[PDB]
Amino acid sequence: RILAPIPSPPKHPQYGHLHYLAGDAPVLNFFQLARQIPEGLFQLDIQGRTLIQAYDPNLVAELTDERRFQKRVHPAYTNIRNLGGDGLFTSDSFEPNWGKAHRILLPAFSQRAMKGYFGQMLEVAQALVGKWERTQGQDVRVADDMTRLTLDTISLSGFDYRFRSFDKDELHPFLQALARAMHHTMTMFSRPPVLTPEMEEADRAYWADIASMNELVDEVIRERRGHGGGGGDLLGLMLNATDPETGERLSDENIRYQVMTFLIAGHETTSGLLAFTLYLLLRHPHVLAQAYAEVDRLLPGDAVPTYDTVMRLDVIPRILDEALRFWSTIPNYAVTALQDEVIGGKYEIRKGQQLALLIPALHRHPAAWTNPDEFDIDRWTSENRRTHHPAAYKPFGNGMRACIGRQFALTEAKLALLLILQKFALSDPYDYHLKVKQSLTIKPEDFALRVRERRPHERFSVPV
Ligand code: HEM
């Protein structure tokens, strides 16, 4: 109009910008376009909508300003809200139950709260190690076993339910329902207006699944309020805690939604972090050797780790942070424009437009990361960490709407890597070619490794 236009790449009357949306992982197509447009952002004119991907660290520092751009439930989250409800992940900050749930749960997710969950985390991690011990020489299904690990951990810490997912290949009917529900939610975005016979019955089953999950969690709540409530659990906490400002408690409906919300937002994000980390250690095996050495200094023999142990880790935490930089598992979350705004002093953003953070480009943008495409766990160290661009690492969201579960997922995954590397030697039997699938989150699809028990003489410890 009087300033610069956002760059748009055109490709034939055949197709359009729509080809950039096909495939298992569109965010990766966006990443390929961001490497060839150094301006810092681009736009796709899809039919009926405009999508703006931003990745320059200074343009992102602008989009991070909650005074101008904020999370907005409408469009993007409206389907996932079918089962997220008004819980933390699928509500706007100005809805009463967001402020309430935030102010109540924030302390229960703090780093100080983690020690109290460590027992349950360790139970689930040892279950996983057991399954792999019992199947040495068999193909380990990495995505699936991490899904099990984290789904079980967040259920056990979230409402003290044990799905015992390492006892049997079949998942509990509740988790099968969760799985079907989530996938239907992701396909609901592509809605052909004519509804096929099978689509209408898909929807019937969809709300039936949502109902059967609501039913199990409603019953757990009923049965523990009957026993006096007050477990040392996220559900135990929500049954009793009062909001510091409103003085009231969460409703029963909101508590069921927060439990569903823990499951939605916490299982595939964390399991993907672990799937990817294992892939990266397999393709950067000198780092994996460093990890082995850390494990053999702190967990020699059949030592059983404590929360303290996890806290004294160094290699494994930085492996995890750098892994998040390569493959952040929620890669394309959008901020909405509160008012018409001008970014970089250059581009024209109309009120209510979605700016998707292209996390892959941002985390690998060479302006902020010398040698962007190379794995260095030493980038994260106290001193080198302070040298990073302050808006270019955003694996856990932004501001008021940043992931509450960060410390939960990071302690869970430190523990997982610790116990796995303690007991197992990893092998890649098939030349795994990374294959990314995107839903709410991105994750490796057909990853298979093999494990042997580590022989005593293969530990880098100091003898008894
Ligand atoms: C590595 C694992 C995880 C990563 C990378 C991650 C990342 C993120 C990101 C990027 C967001 C922002 C979403 C948006 O603004 O649209 C978010 C939100 C959220 N995540 Fe996580 N998350 C992880 C694990 C977890 C876990 C384990 C929990 C709890 C069990 C959790 C609970 C939440 C919640 C409640 C929100 C909404 C925050 C609010 O509105 O107050 N996340 N997460």
mmCIF file of all heavy atoms in Angstrom, residues 71 77 87-91 98 102 109 154 234 258 261-263 265-267 269-270 273 324 328-330 333-334 394-398 400-406 408-410 412, ligand 1:
data_model
loop_
_atom_site.group_PDB
_atom_site.id
_atom_site.type_symbol
_atom_site.label_atom_id
_atom_site.label_comp_id
_atom_site.label_asym_id
_atom_site.label_seq_id
_atom_site.Cartn_x
_atom_site.Cartn_y
_atom_site.Cartn_z
ATOM 1 N N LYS A 71 -1.557 -15.733 21.320
ATOM 2 C CA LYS A 71 -2.242 -16.967 20.945
ATOM 3 C C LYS A 71 -3.733 -16.703 20.837
ATOM 4 O O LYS A 71 -4.300 -15.962 21.640
ATOM 5 C CB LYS A 71 -1.987 -18.081 21.966
ATOM 6 C CG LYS A 71 -2.435 -19.472 21.475
ATOM 7 C CD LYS A 71 -2.240 -20.563 22.524
ATOM 8 C CE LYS A 71 -2.866 -21.853 22.042
ATOM 9 N NZ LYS A 71 -2.343 -23.013 22.789
ATOM 10 N N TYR A 77 -7.100 -23.736 16.713
ATOM 11 C CA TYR A 77 -7.311 -24.730 17.756
ATOM 12 C C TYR A 77 -8.753 -25.214 17.855
ATOM 13 O O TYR A 77 -9.039 -26.036 18.725
ATOM 14 C CB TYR A 77 -6.859 -24.174 19.117
ATOM 15 C CG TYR A 77 -5.418 -23.689 19.118
ATOM 16 C CD1 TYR A 77 -5.118 -22.370 18.855
ATOM 17 C CD2 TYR A 77 -4.358 -24.557 19.355
ATOM 18 C CE1 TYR A 77 -3.812 -21.931 18.834
ATOM 19 C CE2 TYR A 77 -3.052 -24.123 19.333
ATOM 20 C CZ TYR A 77 -2.785 -22.808 19.069
ATOM 21 O OH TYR A 77 -1.494 -22.341 19.043
ATOM 22 N N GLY A 87 -9.617 -26.275 28.723
ATOM 23 C CA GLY A 87 -8.387 -26.503 29.446
ATOM 24 C C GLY A 87 -7.280 -25.606 28.927
ATOM 25 O O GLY A 87 -7.438 -24.893 27.933
ATOM 26 N N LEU A 88 -6.121 -25.671 29.610
ATOM 27 C CA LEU A 88 -5.002 -24.771 29.310
ATOM 28 C C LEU A 88 -4.684 -24.705 27.816
ATOM 29 O O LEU A 88 -4.437 -23.625 27.280
ATOM 30 C CB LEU A 88 -3.766 -25.197 30.086
ATOM 31 C CG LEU A 88 -3.875 -25.005 31.575
ATOM 32 C CD1 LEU A 88 -2.613 -25.547 32.218
ATOM 33 C CD2 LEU A 88 -4.104 -23.526 31.911
ATOM 34 N N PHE A 89 -4.672 -25.837 27.116
ATOM 35 C CA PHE A 89 -4.110 -25.768 25.773
ATOM 36 C C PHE A 89 -5.094 -25.192 24.753
ATOM 37 O O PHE A 89 -4.662 -24.569 23.776
ATOM 38 C CB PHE A 89 -3.593 -27.147 25.322
ATOM 39 C CG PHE A 89 -2.787 -27.122 24.025
ATOM 40 C CD1 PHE A 89 -1.405 -26.986 24.042
ATOM 41 C CD2 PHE A 89 -3.417 -27.253 22.798
ATOM 42 C CE1 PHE A 89 -0.661 -26.975 22.864
ATOM 43 C CE2 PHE A 89 -2.677 -27.244 21.606
ATOM 44 C CZ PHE A 89 -1.294 -27.112 21.644
ATOM 45 N N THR A 90 -6.406 -25.360 24.938
ATOM 46 C CA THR A 90 -7.332 -25.017 23.855
ATOM 47 C C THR A 90 -8.238 -23.831 24.163
ATOM 48 O O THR A 90 -9.288 -23.699 23.526
ATOM 49 C CB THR A 90 -8.177 -26.226 23.472
ATOM 50 O OG1 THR A 90 -8.606 -26.895 24.660
ATOM 51 C CG2 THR A 90 -7.337 -27.176 22.656
ATOM 52 N N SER A 91 -7.842 -22.946 25.089
ATOM 53 C CA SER A 91 -8.647 -21.792 25.494
ATOM 54 C C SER A 91 -7.865 -20.486 25.368
ATOM 55 O O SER A 91 -6.627 -20.470 25.346
ATOM 56 C CB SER A 91 -9.154 -21.925 26.947
ATOM 57 O OG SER A 91 -8.113 -22.291 27.841
ATOM 58 N N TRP A 98 -9.114 -20.449 31.976
ATOM 59 C CA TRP A 98 -7.673 -20.423 31.696
ATOM 60 C C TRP A 98 -6.902 -19.783 32.838
ATOM 61 O O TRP A 98 -5.983 -20.390 33.383
ATOM 62 C CB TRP A 98 -7.328 -19.689 30.404
ATOM 63 C CG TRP A 98 -5.854 -19.836 30.055
ATOM 64 C CD1 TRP A 98 -5.298 -20.789 29.243
ATOM 65 C CD2 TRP A 98 -4.760 -19.030 30.516
ATOM 66 N NE1 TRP A 98 -3.934 -20.621 29.168
ATOM 67 C CE2 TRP A 98 -3.579 -19.552 29.945
ATOM 68 C CE3 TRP A 98 -4.659 -17.930 31.361
ATOM 69 C CZ2 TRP A 98 -2.332 -19.007 30.189
ATOM 70 C CZ3 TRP A 98 -3.399 -17.399 31.606
ATOM 71 C CH2 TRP A 98 -2.263 -17.933 31.026
ATOM 72 N N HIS A 102 -4.388 -22.034 34.992
ATOM 73 C CA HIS A 102 -3.012 -21.558 34.992
ATOM 74 C C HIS A 102 -2.509 -21.278 36.412
ATOM 75 O O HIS A 102 -1.498 -21.845 36.855
ATOM 76 C CB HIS A 102 -2.943 -20.299 34.122
ATOM 77 C CG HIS A 102 -1.566 -19.760 33.933
ATOM 78 N ND1 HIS A 102 -0.563 -20.478 33.311
ATOM 79 C CD2 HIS A 102 -1.023 -18.572 34.274
ATOM 80 C CE1 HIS A 102 0.543 -19.758 33.289
ATOM 81 N NE2 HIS A 102 0.290 -18.598 33.869
ATOM 82 N N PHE A 109 3.663 -27.717 38.271
ATOM 83 C CA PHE A 109 4.525 -28.045 37.144
ATOM 84 C C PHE A 109 5.915 -27.445 37.263
ATOM 85 O O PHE A 109 6.735 -27.628 36.357
ATOM 86 C CB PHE A 109 3.896 -27.576 35.838
ATOM 87 C CG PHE A 109 2.859 -28.492 35.314
ATOM 88 C CD1 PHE A 109 1.523 -28.250 35.548
ATOM 89 C CD2 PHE A 109 3.217 -29.596 34.565
ATOM 90 C CE1 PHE A 109 0.561 -29.103 35.043
ATOM 91 C CE2 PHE A 109 2.275 -30.448 34.066
ATOM 92 C CZ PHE A 109 0.943 -30.205 34.298
ATOM 93 N N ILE A 154 2.304 -39.732 31.845
ATOM 94 C CA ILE A 154 1.427 -38.596 32.083
ATOM 95 C C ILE A 154 0.111 -39.063 32.665
ATOM 96 O O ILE A 154 -0.478 -38.336 33.460
ATOM 97 C CB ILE A 154 1.207 -37.732 30.835
ATOM 98 C CG1 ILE A 154 2.549 -37.220 30.337
ATOM 99 C CG2 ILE A 154 0.404 -36.505 31.209
ATOM 100 C CD1 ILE A 154 2.805 -37.505 28.863
ATOM 101 N N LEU A 234 -1.580 -34.705 40.025
ATOM 102 C CA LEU A 234 -2.177 -33.512 39.402
ATOM 103 C C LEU A 234 -3.696 -33.512 39.609
ATOM 104 O O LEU A 234 -4.225 -32.444 39.893
ATOM 105 C CB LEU A 234 -1.760 -33.461 37.934
ATOM 106 C CG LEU A 234 -0.345 -32.963 37.662
ATOM 107 C CD1 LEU A 234 0.090 -33.328 36.257
ATOM 108 C CD2 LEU A 234 -0.259 -31.465 37.872
ATOM 109 N N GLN A 258 -8.675 -30.559 31.885
ATOM 110 C CA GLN A 258 -7.238 -30.453 32.118
ATOM 111 C C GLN A 258 -6.563 -31.821 32.046
ATOM 112 O O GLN A 258 -5.416 -31.919 31.609
ATOM 113 C CB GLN A 258 -6.958 -29.753 33.463
ATOM 114 C CG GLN A 258 -7.674 -28.394 33.611
ATOM 115 C CD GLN A 258 -7.187 -27.313 32.632
ATOM 116 O OE1 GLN A 258 -6.106 -27.451 32.044
ATOM 117 N NE2 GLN A 258 -7.984 -26.215 32.472
ATOM 118 N N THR A 261 -6.257 -32.609 28.642
ATOM 119 C CA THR A 261 -5.295 -31.678 28.073
ATOM 120 C C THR A 261 -3.874 -32.170 28.313
ATOM 121 O O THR A 261 -3.034 -32.138 27.408
ATOM 122 C CB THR A 261 -5.504 -30.275 28.648
ATOM 123 O OG1 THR A 261 -6.537 -29.594 27.903
ATOM 124 C CG2 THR A 261 -4.202 -29.479 28.579
ATOM 125 N N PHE A 262 -3.588 -32.642 29.528
ATOM 126 C CA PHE A 262 -2.307 -33.291 29.768
ATOM 127 C C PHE A 262 -2.049 -34.370 28.724
ATOM 128 O O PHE A 262 -0.953 -34.433 28.153
ATOM 129 C CB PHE A 262 -2.256 -33.904 31.161
ATOM 130 C CG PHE A 262 -2.525 -32.938 32.271
ATOM 131 C CD1 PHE A 262 -2.845 -33.415 33.526
ATOM 132 C CD2 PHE A 262 -2.450 -31.566 32.078
ATOM 133 C CE1 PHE A 262 -3.080 -32.579 34.564
ATOM 134 C CE2 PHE A 262 -2.704 -30.713 33.125
ATOM 135 C CZ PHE A 262 -3.016 -31.229 34.375
ATOM 136 N N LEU A 263 -3.061 -35.197 28.421
ATOM 137 C CA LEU A 263 -2.786 -36.296 27.492
ATOM 138 C C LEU A 263 -2.491 -35.767 26.090
ATOM 139 O O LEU A 263 -1.424 -36.055 25.523
ATOM 140 C CB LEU A 263 -3.928 -37.305 27.482
ATOM 141 C CG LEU A 263 -3.957 -38.149 28.757
ATOM 142 C CD1 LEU A 263 -5.308 -38.759 28.964
ATOM 143 C CD2 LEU A 263 -2.962 -39.238 28.650
ATOM 144 N N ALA A 265 -1.580 -32.707 24.955
ATOM 145 C CA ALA A 265 -0.404 -31.885 24.751
ATOM 146 C C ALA A 265 0.872 -32.542 25.237
ATOM 147 O O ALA A 265 1.950 -32.115 24.822
ATOM 148 C CB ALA A 265 -0.559 -30.531 25.445
ATOM 149 N N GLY A 266 0.797 -33.565 26.080
ATOM 150 C CA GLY A 266 2.016 -34.065 26.645
ATOM 151 C C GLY A 266 2.481 -35.381 26.065
ATOM 152 O O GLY A 266 3.627 -35.766 26.326
ATOM 153 N N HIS A 267 1.658 -36.115 25.299
ATOM 154 C CA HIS A 267 2.270 -37.410 25.013
ATOM 155 C C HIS A 267 3.079 -37.415 23.719
ATOM 156 O O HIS A 267 4.236 -37.849 23.738
ATOM 157 C CB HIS A 267 1.227 -38.530 25.028
ATOM 158 C CG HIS A 267 0.540 -38.770 23.728
ATOM 159 N ND1 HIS A 267 1.012 -39.667 22.790
ATOM 160 C CD2 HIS A 267 -0.619 -38.277 23.235
ATOM 161 C CE1 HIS A 267 0.182 -39.691 21.762
ATOM 162 N NE2 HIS A 267 -0.818 -38.861 22.010
ATOM 163 N N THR A 269 4.273 -34.884 21.851
ATOM 164 C CA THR A 269 5.386 -33.946 21.925
ATOM 165 C C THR A 269 6.604 -34.549 22.633
ATOM 166 O O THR A 269 7.735 -34.473 22.130
ATOM 167 C CB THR A 269 4.896 -32.710 22.643
ATOM 168 O OG1 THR A 269 4.609 -33.065 24.001
ATOM 169 C CG2 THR A 269 3.602 -32.282 22.008
ATOM 170 N N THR A 270 6.397 -35.177 23.796
ATOM 171 C CA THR A 270 7.526 -35.757 24.524
ATOM 172 C C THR A 270 8.038 -37.013 23.833
ATOM 173 O O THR A 270 9.255 -37.198 23.671
ATOM 174 C CB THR A 270 7.146 -36.088 25.961
ATOM 175 O OG1 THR A 270 6.281 -35.080 26.474
ATOM 176 C CG2 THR A 270 8.364 -36.116 26.824
ATOM 177 N N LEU A 273 10.130 -36.019 21.039
ATOM 178 C CA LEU A 273 11.456 -35.605 21.471
ATOM 179 C C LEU A 273 12.353 -36.814 21.666
ATOM 180 O O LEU A 273 13.518 -36.796 21.260
ATOM 181 C CB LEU A 273 11.393 -34.773 22.752
ATOM 182 C CG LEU A 273 12.792 -34.473 23.307
ATOM 183 C CD1 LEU A 273 13.639 -33.837 22.226
ATOM 184 C CD2 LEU A 273 12.708 -33.580 24.510
ATOM 185 N N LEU A 324 15.905 -30.646 20.539
ATOM 186 C CA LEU A 324 14.736 -29.788 20.387
ATOM 187 C C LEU A 324 14.976 -28.715 19.335
ATOM 188 O O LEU A 324 14.034 -28.302 18.638
ATOM 189 C CB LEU A 324 14.358 -29.163 21.733
ATOM 190 C CG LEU A 324 13.388 -29.990 22.557
ATOM 191 C CD1 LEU A 324 13.005 -29.207 23.757
ATOM 192 C CD2 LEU A 324 12.188 -30.259 21.684
ATOM 193 N N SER A 328 12.120 -29.590 16.873
ATOM 194 C CA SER A 328 11.094 -29.260 17.842
ATOM 195 C C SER A 328 9.784 -29.901 17.411
ATOM 196 O O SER A 328 9.410 -29.844 16.233
ATOM 197 C CB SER A 328 10.952 -27.756 17.983
ATOM 198 O OG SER A 328 12.162 -27.268 18.523
ATOM 199 N N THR A 329 9.110 -30.546 18.360
ATOM 200 C CA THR A 329 8.034 -31.449 17.998
ATOM 201 C C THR A 329 6.674 -30.769 17.853
ATOM 202 O O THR A 329 5.762 -31.401 17.307
ATOM 203 C CB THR A 329 7.962 -32.615 19.000
ATOM 204 O OG1 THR A 329 8.105 -32.117 20.332
ATOM 205 C CG2 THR A 329 9.083 -33.625 18.713
ATOM 206 N N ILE A 330 6.510 -29.511 18.271
ATOM 207 C CA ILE A 330 5.393 -28.706 17.754
ATOM 208 C C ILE A 330 6.005 -27.607 16.899
ATOM 209 O O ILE A 330 6.583 -26.653 17.447
ATOM 210 C CB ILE A 330 4.501 -28.111 18.854
ATOM 211 C CG1 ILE A 330 4.007 -29.205 19.794
ATOM 212 C CG2 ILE A 330 3.305 -27.431 18.210
ATOM 213 C CD1 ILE A 330 2.709 -28.867 20.512
ATOM 214 N N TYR A 333 3.347 -23.473 15.397
ATOM 215 C CA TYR A 333 2.251 -22.824 16.080
ATOM 216 C C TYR A 333 2.220 -21.353 15.729
ATOM 217 O O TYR A 333 3.266 -20.718 15.585
ATOM 218 C CB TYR A 333 2.362 -22.989 17.583
ATOM 219 C CG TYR A 333 3.642 -22.523 18.196
ATOM 220 C CD1 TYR A 333 3.735 -21.261 18.764
ATOM 221 C CD2 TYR A 333 4.739 -23.367 18.266
ATOM 222 C CE1 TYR A 333 4.903 -20.841 19.351
ATOM 223 C CE2 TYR A 333 5.905 -22.960 18.853
ATOM 224 C CZ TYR A 333 5.991 -21.691 19.393
ATOM 225 O OH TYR A 333 7.165 -21.276 19.994
ATOM 226 N N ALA A 334 1.003 -20.810 15.615
ATOM 227 C CA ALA A 334 0.768 -19.457 15.134
ATOM 228 C C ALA A 334 0.467 -18.510 16.283
ATOM 229 O O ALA A 334 -0.102 -18.913 17.301
ATOM 230 C CB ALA A 334 -0.396 -19.425 14.149
ATOM 231 N N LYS A 394 12.511 -21.406 20.560
ATOM 232 C CA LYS A 394 11.128 -21.346 21.021
ATOM 233 C C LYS A 394 10.466 -22.717 20.997
ATOM 234 O O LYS A 394 9.301 -22.839 20.637
ATOM 235 C CB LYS A 394 10.349 -20.351 20.172
ATOM 236 C CG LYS A 394 10.709 -18.904 20.345
ATOM 237 C CD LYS A 394 10.655 -18.528 21.802
ATOM 238 C CE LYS A 394 10.551 -17.048 21.994
ATOM 239 N NZ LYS A 394 10.169 -16.803 23.398
ATOM 240 N N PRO A 395 11.177 -23.770 21.409
ATOM 241 C CA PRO A 395 10.579 -25.112 21.389
ATOM 242 C C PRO A 395 9.383 -25.250 22.317
ATOM 243 O O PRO A 395 8.534 -26.109 22.068
ATOM 244 C CB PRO A 395 11.745 -26.003 21.844
ATOM 245 C CG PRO A 395 12.458 -25.150 22.827
ATOM 246 C CD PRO A 395 12.394 -23.753 22.248
ATOM 247 N N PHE A 396 9.262 -24.435 23.372
ATOM 248 C CA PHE A 396 8.139 -24.579 24.287
ATOM 249 C C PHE A 396 7.252 -23.334 24.286
ATOM 250 O O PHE A 396 6.746 -22.919 25.337
ATOM 251 C CB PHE A 396 8.607 -24.888 25.709
ATOM 252 C CG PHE A 396 9.467 -26.131 25.846
ATOM 253 C CD1 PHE A 396 10.795 -26.037 26.243
ATOM 254 C CD2 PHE A 396 8.946 -27.392 25.635
ATOM 255 C CE1 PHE A 396 11.590 -27.174 26.394
ATOM 256 C CE2 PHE A 396 9.745 -28.536 25.787
ATOM 257 C CZ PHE A 396 11.064 -28.424 26.160
ATOM 258 N N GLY A 397 7.032 -22.727 23.109
ATOM 259 C CA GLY A 397 6.068 -21.634 23.010
ATOM 260 C C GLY A 397 6.547 -20.308 23.577
ATOM 261 O O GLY A 397 7.739 -20.073 23.771
ATOM 262 N N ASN A 398 5.592 -19.422 23.859
ATOM 263 C CA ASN A 398 5.964 -18.046 24.157
ATOM 264 C C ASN A 398 5.096 -17.417 25.232
ATOM 265 O O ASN A 398 3.868 -17.447 25.145
ATOM 266 C CB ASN A 398 5.872 -17.185 22.912
ATOM 267 C CG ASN A 398 6.589 -15.873 23.076
ATOM 268 O OD1 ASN A 398 7.706 -15.819 23.609
ATOM 269 N ND2 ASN A 398 5.939 -14.797 22.655
ATOM 270 N N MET A 400 2.943 -15.884 28.261
ATOM 271 C CA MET A 400 1.869 -16.463 29.058
ATOM 272 C C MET A 400 1.474 -17.831 28.535
ATOM 273 O O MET A 400 1.140 -18.720 29.325
ATOM 274 C CB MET A 400 0.624 -15.570 29.062
ATOM 275 C CG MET A 400 0.656 -14.276 29.882
ATOM 276 S SD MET A 400 1.398 -14.271 31.547
ATOM 277 C CE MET A 400 0.999 -15.892 32.175
ATOM 278 N N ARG A 401 1.510 -18.025 27.205
ATOM 279 C CA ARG A 401 1.077 -19.269 26.581
ATOM 280 C C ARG A 401 2.226 -20.223 26.286
ATOM 281 O O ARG A 401 2.165 -20.990 25.307
ATOM 282 C CB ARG A 401 0.306 -18.959 25.304
ATOM 283 C CG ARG A 401 -0.653 -17.858 25.533
ATOM 284 C CD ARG A 401 -1.564 -18.227 26.696
ATOM 285 N NE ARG A 401 -2.264 -19.503 26.511
ATOM 286 C CZ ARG A 401 -3.382 -19.661 25.794
ATOM 287 N NH1 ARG A 401 -3.944 -18.626 25.170
ATOM 288 N NH2 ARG A 401 -3.945 -20.855 25.697
ATOM 289 N N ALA A 402 3.277 -20.192 27.092
ATOM 290 C CA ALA A 402 4.363 -21.148 26.950
ATOM 291 C C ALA A 402 4.005 -22.452 27.642
ATOM 292 O O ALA A 402 3.221 -22.477 28.591
ATOM 293 C CB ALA A 402 5.651 -20.587 27.539
ATOM 294 N N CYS A 403 4.611 -23.539 27.175
ATOM 295 C CA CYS A 403 4.286 -24.868 27.688
ATOM 296 C C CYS A 403 4.472 -24.918 29.201
ATOM 297 O O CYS A 403 5.553 -24.631 29.709
ATOM 298 C CB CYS A 403 5.152 -25.923 27.001
ATOM 299 S SG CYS A 403 5.088 -27.593 27.721
ATOM 300 N N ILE A 404 3.406 -25.275 29.916
ATOM 301 C CA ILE A 404 3.496 -25.475 31.346
ATOM 302 C C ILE A 404 4.246 -26.749 31.666
ATOM 303 O O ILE A 404 4.774 -26.902 32.774
ATOM 304 C CB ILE A 404 2.081 -25.539 31.930
ATOM 305 C CG1 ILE A 404 2.106 -25.524 33.459
ATOM 306 C CG2 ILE A 404 1.410 -26.774 31.409
ATOM 307 C CD1 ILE A 404 0.760 -25.122 34.106
ATOM 308 N N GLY A 405 4.296 -27.675 30.726
ATOM 309 C CA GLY A 405 4.837 -28.983 30.980
ATOM 310 C C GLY A 405 6.295 -29.139 30.669
ATOM 311 O O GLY A 405 6.821 -30.259 30.703
ATOM 312 N N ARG A 406 6.964 -28.043 30.334
ATOM 313 C CA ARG A 406 8.354 -28.143 29.932
ATOM 314 C C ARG A 406 9.118 -28.991 30.935
ATOM 315 O O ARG A 406 9.646 -30.056 30.588
ATOM 316 C CB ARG A 406 8.977 -26.755 29.785
ATOM 317 C CG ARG A 406 10.457 -26.805 29.547
ATOM 318 C CD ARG A 406 11.082 -25.440 29.381
ATOM 319 N NE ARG A 406 12.535 -25.533 29.465
ATOM 320 C CZ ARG A 406 13.197 -25.620 30.618
ATOM 321 N NH1 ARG A 406 12.519 -25.611 31.763
ATOM 322 N NH2 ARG A 406 14.531 -25.734 30.637
ATOM 323 N N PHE A 408 8.230 -31.023 33.133
ATOM 324 C CA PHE A 408 7.787 -32.413 33.193
ATOM 325 C C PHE A 408 8.393 -33.230 32.059
ATOM 326 O O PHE A 408 8.987 -34.291 32.298
ATOM 327 C CB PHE A 408 6.263 -32.499 33.160
ATOM 328 C CG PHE A 408 5.721 -33.846 33.569
ATOM 329 C CD1 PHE A 408 5.302 -34.079 34.882
ATOM 330 C CD2 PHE A 408 5.630 -34.884 32.641
ATOM 331 C CE1 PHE A 408 4.801 -35.320 35.261
ATOM 332 C CE2 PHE A 408 5.125 -36.129 33.009
ATOM 333 C CZ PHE A 408 4.708 -36.349 34.322
ATOM 334 N N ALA A 409 8.269 -32.746 30.816
ATOM 335 C CA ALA A 409 8.778 -33.512 29.676
ATOM 336 C C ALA A 409 10.296 -33.661 29.731
ATOM 337 O O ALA A 409 10.829 -34.721 29.392
ATOM 338 C CB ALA A 409 8.360 -32.861 28.353
ATOM 339 N N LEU A 410 11.009 -32.620 30.177
ATOM 340 C CA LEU A 410 12.467 -32.693 30.186
ATOM 341 C C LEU A 410 12.969 -33.639 31.266
ATOM 342 O O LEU A 410 13.949 -34.367 31.043
ATOM 343 C CB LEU A 410 13.082 -31.301 30.350
ATOM 344 C CG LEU A 410 12.843 -30.514 29.064
ATOM 345 C CD1 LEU A 410 13.431 -29.125 29.105
ATOM 346 C CD2 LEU A 410 13.373 -31.311 27.891
ATOM 347 N N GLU A 412 11.177 -36.258 32.466
ATOM 348 C CA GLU A 412 10.826 -37.570 31.916
ATOM 349 C C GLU A 412 11.854 -38.051 30.876
ATOM 350 O O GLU A 412 12.301 -39.209 30.925
ATOM 351 C CB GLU A 412 9.427 -37.532 31.308
ATOM 352 C CG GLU A 412 8.945 -38.849 30.827
ATOM 353 C CD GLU A 412 7.618 -38.735 30.062
ATOM 354 O OE1 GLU A 412 7.015 -37.626 29.989
ATOM 355 O OE2 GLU A 412 7.169 -39.774 29.519
HETATM 356 C C1 HEM B 1 9.091 -31.971 24.726
HETATM 357 C C2 HEM B 1 7.815 -32.022 25.132
HETATM 358 C C3 HEM B 1 6.900 -30.795 24.905
HETATM 359 C C4 HEM B 1 7.086 -29.775 24.063
HETATM 360 C C5 HEM B 1 8.220 -29.553 23.025
HETATM 361 C C6 HEM B 1 5.997 -28.863 24.258
HETATM 362 C C7 HEM B 1 5.826 -27.694 23.550
HETATM 363 C C8 HEM B 1 4.755 -26.838 23.667
HETATM 364 C C9 HEM B 1 4.451 -25.692 22.827
HETATM 365 C C10 HEM B 1 5.276 -25.152 21.631
HETATM 366 C C11 HEM B 1 3.325 -25.136 23.268
HETATM 367 C C12 HEM B 1 2.673 -23.885 22.652
HETATM 368 C C13 HEM B 1 1.434 -24.307 21.879
HETATM 369 C C14 HEM B 1 0.778 -23.081 21.299
HETATM 370 O O1 HEM B 1 1.054 -21.929 21.748
HETATM 371 O O2 HEM B 1 -0.043 -23.283 20.375
HETATM 372 C C15 HEM B 1 2.852 -25.912 24.398
HETATM 373 C C16 HEM B 1 1.708 -25.667 25.141
HETATM 374 C C17 HEM B 1 1.288 -26.420 26.211
HETATM 375 N N1 HEM B 1 1.870 -27.610 26.611
HETATM 376 FE FE1 HEM B 1 3.630 -28.440 26.012
HETATM 377 N N2 HEM B 1 5.173 -29.363 25.243
HETATM 378 C C18 HEM B 1 5.708 -30.549 25.662
HETATM 379 C C19 HEM B 1 5.250 -31.393 26.632
HETATM 380 C C20 HEM B 1 4.198 -31.126 27.435
HETATM 381 C C21 HEM B 1 3.772 -31.908 28.572
HETATM 382 C C22 HEM B 1 4.464 -33.206 29.084
HETATM 383 C C23 HEM B 1 2.712 -31.268 29.093
HETATM 384 C C24 HEM B 1 1.847 -31.733 30.286
HETATM 385 C C25 HEM B 1 1.698 -33.063 30.496
HETATM 386 C C26 HEM B 1 2.428 -30.113 28.270
HETATM 387 C C27 HEM B 1 1.406 -29.213 28.462
HETATM 388 C C28 HEM B 1 1.167 -28.066 27.718
HETATM 389 C C29 HEM B 1 0.109 -27.103 28.000
HETATM 390 C C30 HEM B 1 -0.915 -27.212 29.161
HETATM 391 C C31 HEM B 1 0.162 -26.117 27.088
HETATM 392 C C32 HEM B 1 -0.785 -24.866 27.031
HETATM 393 C C33 HEM B 1 -0.132 -23.739 27.847
HETATM 394 C C34 HEM B 1 -1.115 -22.709 28.382
HETATM 395 O O3 HEM B 1 -1.976 -22.292 27.554
HETATM 396 O O4 HEM B 1 -1.019 -22.306 29.607
HETATM 397 N N3 HEM B 1 3.372 -30.046 27.269
HETATM 398 N N4 HEM B 1 3.762 -26.945 24.614
#
